[PDB]
Amino acid sequence: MRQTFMANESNIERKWYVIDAEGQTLGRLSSEVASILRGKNKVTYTPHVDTGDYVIVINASKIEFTGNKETDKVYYRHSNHPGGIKSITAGELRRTNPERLIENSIKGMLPSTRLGEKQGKKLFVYGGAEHPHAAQQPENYELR
Amino acid sequence: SRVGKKIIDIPSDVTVTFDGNHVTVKGPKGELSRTLNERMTFKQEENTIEVVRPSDSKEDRTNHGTTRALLNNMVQGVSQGYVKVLELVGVGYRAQMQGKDLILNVGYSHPVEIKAEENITFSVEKNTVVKVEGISKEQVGALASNIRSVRPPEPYKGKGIRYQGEYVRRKEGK
Amino acid sequence: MKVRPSVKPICEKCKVIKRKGKVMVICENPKHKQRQG
Amino acid sequence: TKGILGRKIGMTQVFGENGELIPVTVVEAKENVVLQKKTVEVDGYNAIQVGFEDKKAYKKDAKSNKYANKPAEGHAKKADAAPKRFIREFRNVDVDAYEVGQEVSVDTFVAGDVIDVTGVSKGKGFQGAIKRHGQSRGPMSHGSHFHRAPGSVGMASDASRVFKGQKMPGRMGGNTVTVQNLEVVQVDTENKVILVKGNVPGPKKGLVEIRTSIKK
RNA sequence: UUGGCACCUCGAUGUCGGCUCAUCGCAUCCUGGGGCUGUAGUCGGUCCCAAGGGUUGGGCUGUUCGCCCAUUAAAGCGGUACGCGAGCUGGGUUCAGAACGUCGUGAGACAGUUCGGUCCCUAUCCGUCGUGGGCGUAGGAAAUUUGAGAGGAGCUGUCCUU
RNA sequence: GGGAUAAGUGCUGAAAGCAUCUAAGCAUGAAGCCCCCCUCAAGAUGAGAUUUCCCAACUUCGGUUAUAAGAUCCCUCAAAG
Ligand SMILES: [Mg+2]
Ligand SMILES: [Mg+2]
Ligand SMILES: [Mg+2]
Ligand SMILES: [Mg+2]
Ligand SMILES: [Mg+2]
Ligand SMILES: [Mg+2]
Ligand SMILES: [Mg+2]
Ligand SMILES: [Mg+2]
Ligand SMILES: [Mg+2]
Ligand SMILES: [Mg+2]
Ligand SMILES: [Mg+2]
Ligand SMILES: [Zn+2]
Numbered sequence A: 001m002r003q004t005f006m007a008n009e010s011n012i013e014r015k016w017y018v019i020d021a022e023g024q025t026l027g028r029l030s031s032e033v034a035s036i037l038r039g040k041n042k043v044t045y046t047p048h049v050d051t052g053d054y055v056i057v058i059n060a061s062k063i064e065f066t067g068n069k070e071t072d073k074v075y076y077r078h079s080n081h082p083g084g085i086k087s088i089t090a091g092e093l094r095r096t097n098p099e100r101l102i103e104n105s106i107k108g109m110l111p112s113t114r115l116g117e118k119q120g121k122k123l124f125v126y127g128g129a130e131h132p133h134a135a136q137q138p139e140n141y142e143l144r
Numbered sequence B: 001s002r003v004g005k006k007i008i009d010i011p012s013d014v015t016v017t018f019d020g021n022h023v024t025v026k027g028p029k030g031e032l033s034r035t036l037n038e039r040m041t042f043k044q045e046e047n048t049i050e051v052v053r054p055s056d057s058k059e060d061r062t063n064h065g066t067t068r069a070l071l072n073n074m075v076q077g078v079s080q081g082y083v084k085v086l087e088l089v090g091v092g093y094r095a096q097m098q099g100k101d102l103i104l105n106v107g108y109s110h111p112v113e114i115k116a117e118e119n120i121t122f123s124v125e126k127n128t129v130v131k132v133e134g135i136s137k138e139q140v141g142a143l144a145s146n147i148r149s150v151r152p153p154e155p156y157k158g159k160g161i162r163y164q165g166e167y168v169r170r171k172e173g174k
Numbered sequence C: 001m002k003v004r005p006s007v008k009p010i011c012e013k014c015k016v017i018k019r020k021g022k023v024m025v026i027c028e029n030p031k032h033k034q035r036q037g
Numbered sequence D: 001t002k003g004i005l006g007r008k009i010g011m012t013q014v015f016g017e018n019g020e021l022i023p024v025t026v027v028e029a030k031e032n033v034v035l036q037k038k039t040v041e042v043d044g045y046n047a048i049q050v051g052f053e054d055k056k057a058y059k060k061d062a063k064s065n066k067y068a069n070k071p072a073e074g075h076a077k078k079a080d081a082a083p084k085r086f087i088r089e090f091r092n093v094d095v096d097a098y099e100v101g102q103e104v105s106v107d108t109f110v111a112g113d114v115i116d117v118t119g120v121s122k123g124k125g126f127q128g129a130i131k132r133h134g135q136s137r138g139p140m141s142h143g144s145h146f147h148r149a150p151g152s153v154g155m156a157s158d159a160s161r162v163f164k165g166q167k168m169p170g171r172m173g174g175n176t177v178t179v180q181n182l183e184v185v186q187v188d189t190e191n192k193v194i195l196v197k198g199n200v201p202g203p204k205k206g207l208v209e210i211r212t213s214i215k216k
Numbered sequence E: 001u002u003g004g005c006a007c008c009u010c011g012a013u014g015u016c017g018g019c020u021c022a023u024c025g026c027a028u029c030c031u032g033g034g035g036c037u038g039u040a041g042u043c044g045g046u047c048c049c050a051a052g053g054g055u056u057g058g059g060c061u062g063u064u065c066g067c068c069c070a071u072u073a074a075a076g077c078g079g080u081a082c083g084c085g086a087g088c089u090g091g092g093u094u095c096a097g098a099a100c101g102u103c104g105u106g107a108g109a110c111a112g113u114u115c116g117g118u119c120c121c122u123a124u125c126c127g128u129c130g131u132g133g134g135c136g137u138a139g140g141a142a143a144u145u146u147g148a149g150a151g152g153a154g155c156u157g158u159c160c161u162u
Numbered sequence F: 001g002g003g004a005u006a007a008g009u010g011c012u013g014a015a016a017g018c019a020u021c022u023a024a025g026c027a028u029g030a031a032g033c034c035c036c037c038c039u040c041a042a043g044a045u046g047a048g049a050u051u052u053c054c055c056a057a058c059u060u061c062g063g064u065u066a067u068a069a070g071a072u073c074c075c076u077c078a079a080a081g
Helices: A026-038 A090-096 A098-108 A114-121 B058-079 B137-150 D070-078 D129-133
Strands: A016-020 A054-058 A074-078 A085-089 A123-125 B015-019 B022-026 B031-035 B041-044 B048-052 B082-089 B094-098 B101-105 B112-114 B121-125 B129-134 B160-163 C002-004 C015-019 C022-026 C034-036 D003-015 D021-028 D032-038 D047-054 D084-090 D114-120 D125-127 D170-172 D176-188 D193-197 D207-212
Touching (some): A026 A054, A026 A114, A074 A090, A098 A114, B022 B058, B031 B058, B048 B058, B058 B137, B094 B121, B101 B121, B101 B137, B112 B137, B129 B137, B137 B160, D003 D084, D021 D176, D032 D070, D032 D084, D084 D207, D129 D170
Parallel strands (some): A016 A054
Antiparallel strands (some): A074 A085, B015 B022, B022 B031, B041 B048, B082 B129, B082 B160, B101 B112, B121 B129, C015 C022, C022 C034, D021 D193, D032 D047, D047 D084, D125 D170
């Protein structure tokens, strides 16, 4: 008999969390955050709905890289114009725009679907320690 | 690291204070502060400072040697300072002191001026000899290098700014 | 500078060193200077 | 740094001291007022909003831009100024010097000042690649069936597409253009006119924005 | 590049050169920064970094090439269906005529030559260049704006002085 | 002009009592990179900001209404097409 529970917007409740990016590797922080955004850590996780929780990331500037990624790691973007390839190093990206580095890493670890895009929108990253979502009453989360 | 193992003697006048890895060395001429490697452990005695490598791993051995040498340089520097003499060679080559800054004329249509830095002294003797004196060995060396870079010694005639004890290879003109 | 895959001492004075992940020869004679590449 | 808004009256010539002929553009910069001052504290950047040329006051059944609307009249009234046809910001000018409701005069600029003039270029309408992009015509004889065409628009199977930024026929003119390093030959306080050496972008009766040259 | 192979296309994938318009690589022609020199200076040789921009007009030939003339800072080398024929030309090549040499008994034939010789197509879709409408942007509006992004530009001679 | 760099050139410096531009550290270094200059740009759905304008009655209390500010139709036109 068909007995599997399916989550719906009526029965889904999304919490808010804060994660400190200080002394955390970009990839390993990103991989864990993506799961929280997807709602993989919930027992009521349903694939076709968003059961995941909102996540706030603070101190994005204090994210750490290993080896020579600071210089060697390059981000390429194309403008869709002939010869329109632009490059930023990971270190430079962290300095100029710490938030984008974190966001892009996590968004790359999310599914490329309409739901997936929505799950990425629930991510909020701030380079400083302070965050503007006090009204949301976020709960501090410690990476496992 | 034989160098690392060797203790750094402290002059009685000089006073050294260690704050974790960072070390502040106080001397009559000046006070120098640097941050040593965290792994390296430093034992301070009134007579002398001893630095011991935590492990026999290469990385620690290299840092031990560097740390020891750096600490020794600071203490010696505050005690006596480091002076490097640069001598201009060739006709029409002269040095003149404008305030703190040094002005050099070396076969350039434009006159050359080098800004003075803190904990550095620029002085010219006979208009051909310049002395850079400071507590920091590195800082003295860096500024001296800049002075030499203005006009480096040429092989053919030896004309240019050179270190007093520098040797220049000589090539026959014709 | 001589840039070549075979970097080796041309004379006794030449000294084999590794700088910035590249093997190089340093010597009093400027000619003997080499860089692996 | 100084900025004034004016209309392009037209071009003329003036004879210099040495008898050199100086081509000049006549600009009328009457009725300039500081309508608003923007600061980093409030707006996030420092600039002065300047309105040029008075328009008629609000009327009940205005069908044209000649008469000011209620929203515009309020903004001008806050400055204690009449409603203005053209309003533009000057970030170059220092906010502290100017005050809201202060008249900006031609006398601010002086003769011999190097300036950058901004205006919308004259509109040419729909134009072909030759006129619009300065492309070469094809042969006009020798069996030619190619005269004013754009030429090849790409390669072949490699790419199999036209690249973005391919120069093709389209609407020409109406672009904002800034001519740099022009000079003020003369300033007439009585006529409210500034004489600018050379030619400035746009049609006659077109708004021109005169600023101190950024490059110095 | 010359080939080898015969795997797509023979109910058609137009073939050389030029023109128009480019675009990309760098094994850099010029300009920029360097090392070494059998580098006196002025000039050079060689090697390393560098693709931002630039990189001419003619005579001969269908030519590509090449040679020549006169320049230039320089007259780069390649890829893009040897870029580009629903963008152009059609001189060469590759139909029917004719002729020469040559071969063939002949009809005829010749990467031998010579003279002449029909280049279609109203853009559906993507793409590209311009120009509007709808809705969104949690009230409805008029203006002035920030810039996440994106594009453009980016070259060099000579002379004087020192 | 500025910042960061390439090939380079160093300063201090050990592994390796010497030496060493590099390992830690610290400088300098190109028409090139990122800026500076010019133009576009909030469908930047992450849709931003500033200033100003308009602001009532009904009602089943769910909301509706024409109207406000405003903008158009239509008409005279060009600097626009
Ligand atoms: Mg050999
Ligand atoms: Mg032509
Ligand atoms: Mg015709
Ligand atoms: Mg085609
Ligand atoms: Mg077979
Ligand atoms: Mg078919
Ligand atoms: Mg190269
Ligand atoms: Mg072809
Ligand atoms: Mg033909
Ligand atoms: Mg025949
Ligand atoms: Mg044949
Ligand atoms: Zn040697």
